[PDB]
Design a binder for this molecule. Sequence first.
Ligand SMILES: COCC(=O)NCc1ccccc1
Ligand SMILES: COCC(=O)NCc1ccccc1
Lengths: 196, 196
Amino acid sequence: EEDAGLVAEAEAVAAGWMLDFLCLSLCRAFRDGRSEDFRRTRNSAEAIIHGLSSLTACQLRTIYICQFLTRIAAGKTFDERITPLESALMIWGSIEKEHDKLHEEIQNLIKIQAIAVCMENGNFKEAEEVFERIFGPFKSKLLMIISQKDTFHSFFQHFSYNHMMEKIKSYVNYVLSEKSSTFLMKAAAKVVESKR
Amino acid sequence: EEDAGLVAEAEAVAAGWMLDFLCLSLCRAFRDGRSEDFRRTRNSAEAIIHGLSSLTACQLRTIYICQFLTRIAAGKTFDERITPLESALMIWGSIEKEHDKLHEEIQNLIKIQAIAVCMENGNFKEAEEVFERIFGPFKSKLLMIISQKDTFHSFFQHFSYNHMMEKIKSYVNYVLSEKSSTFLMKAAAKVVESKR
Ligand SMILES: COCC(=O)NCc1ccccc1
Ligand SMILES: COCC(=O)NCc1ccccc1
């Protein structure tokens, strides 16, 4: 007989398979709004990721998408001394991905919702602290909104939580379609289709 | 397209595959004495087991073997208000398995080591408490040994920690050989063999 190195290699291949499968499940639970399922899959993905010490460019992209969705899911709820949405913003700006229209739309919606979720929770001192960290005449208008506790300002209705979630969900559908063919999920589906 | 029920079924099949793979890895790490690898695989197995709500007779046996090895590995280190080895003893006596010579040998070695590890750590009041919970003229001899702090008594040399670990390791080799053919590890090895 038994070679330790070849067994460790087989375990690394299987960890790679489990990572893609759990990213796929995390994406579907996020899209579906299945919170408890998302929590469980996130816990599993995090544990499996600890079993890997070297990651390829594709695997790094996979773990960062998982970390990003984890912070987005904790958006209305931590070493950092920033908020979950501010942490999602840092991950989003560092993933190896195209900075296209969708990327910029998601970035700006997260920037504004990082402030709006603090106002929604009644913590306006924190909303000013988040604003200072992100931004830190457009800025003067946003800082006046927070100062006046003008939570339902028309600006916040265009840059809403629901709009942020919808744009992120559209991005998740592209990740979901790119990984729907990964080894583990594909083999699992073939077993279920044989039953039936 | 997309059926929620068929996707959930494919995820349950894949969780079942991951469970056997992680049990195999936990068994090899236990046999090899790779403590940090055992800790990581245990964390992964525990997270994956949370993703299952219904288990077959075979899967229940798998999770209980994992729980048993986890308590054995924590033997010298928790709802219960008993010790890790006492907890392993409860799992061992309830697994759906044959109560053969090896089973009885492992049971008795765990019973004595649950007391001896307390003496090894210098906690003799705890050694008496463990003795009372398990047992609770043979008993009178064991209670005299603990009372006299006679840690290196010849009885403890036949019913040693090393003998307990060796007998448990032989049992692990049977579990290891029964699962070496499971889907995930078998497919992982075929990929590594194609490289080499
Ligand atoms: C807090 O720092 C660690 C961290 O990023 N945990 C979140 C996570 C969720 C899912 C997969 C990997 C990681
Ligand atoms: C403490 O109660 C929960 C428990 O048994 N955790 C240990 C465990 C280790 C590996 C697989 C499943 C479980």
